[PDB]
Amino acid sequence: EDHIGDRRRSVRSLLEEAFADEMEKTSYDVEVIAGPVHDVFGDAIHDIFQKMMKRGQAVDFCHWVSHLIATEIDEKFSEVAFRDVQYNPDIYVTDSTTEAKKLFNDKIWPAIDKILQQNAETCPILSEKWSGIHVSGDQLKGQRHKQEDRFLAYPNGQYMDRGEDPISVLAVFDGHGGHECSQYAAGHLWETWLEVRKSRDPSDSLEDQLRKSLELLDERMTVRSVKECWKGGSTAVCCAIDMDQKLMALAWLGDSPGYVMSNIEFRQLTRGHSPSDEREARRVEEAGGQLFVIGGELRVNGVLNLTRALGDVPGRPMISNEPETCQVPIESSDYLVLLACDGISDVFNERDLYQLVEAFANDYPVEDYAELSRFICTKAIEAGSADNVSVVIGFLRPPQDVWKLMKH
Ligand SMILES: [Mg+2]
Ligand SMILES: [Mg+2]
């Protein structure tokens, strides 16, 4: 109503588009290793999310609907309530999770099918209204064999667990040596974030809460990484935005950057954990590592061009898992936050990014704002980036304000 783009649309409208092929089959009368129990639900949500993004929906709807679908499957089809299992550091059960994972795959359409059979008059889910800041998120594989980046863009808790928490959380995770760590981070950050929010002391700043959620995420990831012998790791850059308090926190491990765009420029908020940074080099040396130039750049023990990461258990202590953080007041002249992987910053500097937003806002109408992140990814590949590329954007001021700002 007073909304723009897909935020104008009803749940039914969005589902019927996403599952148009399945509805058509119905109309034609067609009958259309093992992880731990404590990870099943979040694992399922991430798998559903990836499938929903392939069906062409906006990232925020994909987050919301993935939790809905997983919840519906868990309630209607699963013997075990995986959504109610709490992580316990001394418990790790793998009993029948293989069957469970298959269930969360097979029952996606059945879950949605049953919802679409109902009427909004007696089905509350169909009346959902969309809250929170506007976001944009997407990625491209680029000149790579696998997509090892993951990302999150939650306007607030409505899109995580369909609850009431008002804080937005955005993230990008750039995996190396596999996608297991970045996939895990994407599957479970919402869980550790909401756990921290629920248990927070009054003395915990937003910055502390965000840091704690990443510490807890790495703790859970570490257990599974060791049990399954994962070899790789992931960067993280995460942002929590509290619009009421006019505060934004960032936490990062590695070289995926975060920026704020004001009326005049993009400004980088993160400080890359690369061996060329004298501070990081000292941390590596103190941890017993060495820095060698192998190929064209400085690498820790000749392998990693990063000094901090999620996962990388085999690389500890030379590679640190300690997040760096900051907290920044949000001023009235701050327009958007943008998080990306290094695939973007390899080719674009701050001025390039500003000019890309400027170009998009002059070439496309505001109703297409959700496509801005994909635009930047596509432009990065055109500019010769040779990596996976991912971008998430949070609109601190509404898309209308950004378009007004940029209009020639
Ligand atoms: Mg990578
Ligand atoms: Mg990368």
Curated annotation (Swiss-Prot):
It is an enzyme of class 3 (hydrolase). It catalyses: O-phospho-L-seryl-[protein] + H2O = L-seryl-[protein] + phosphate; O-phospho-L-threonyl-[protein] + H2O = L-threonyl-[protein] + phosphate. One of its GO terms (molecular function) is protein serine/threonine phosphatase activity. Changing D174A: Loss of catalytic activity. Mg(2+) 1 binds at D174, G175. Its EC number is 3.1.3.16. Signal peptide: none annotated. Keywords: Apoptosis, Developmental protein, Differentiation, Hydrolase, Magnesium, Manganese, Metal-binding, Protein phosphatase, Sexual differentiation, Ubl conjugation pathway. Transmembrane segments: none annotated. GO terms for cellular component: Cul2-RING ubiquitin ligase complex; protein serine/threonine phosphatase complex; protein-containing complex. Its cofactor is Mg(2+); Mn(2+). Binds 2 magnesium or manganese ions per subunit. Residues 132-396 form the PPM-type phosphatase domain. One of its GO terms (biological process) is sex determination. SMART domains: PP2C_SIG, PP2Cc. Residues 16-22 are annotated as: Interaction with fem-1 and fem-3. Mg(2+) 2 binds at D174, D342, D387. Belongs to the PP2C family. Dephosphorylates auto-phosphorylated Ca(2+)/calmodulin-dependent protein kinase unc-43/CAMKII in vitro. Involved in the regulation of sex determination. Together with fem-3, required for male sexual development by promoting the proteasomal-mediated degradation of tra-1, a transcription repressor of male-specific genes. Promotes apoptosis. Component of a complex containing fem-1, fem-2 and fem-3. Interacts (via N-terminus) with fem-1 and fem-3. Component of the CBC(fem-1) E3 ubiquitin-protein ligase complex, at least composed of cul-2, elc-1, tra-1, fem-1, fem-2 and fem-3; mediates the ubiquitination and subsequent proteasomal degradation of tra-1. Interacts with tra-1. Interacts with sel-10. This is Protein phosphatase fem-2. It comes from Caenorhabditis elegans.
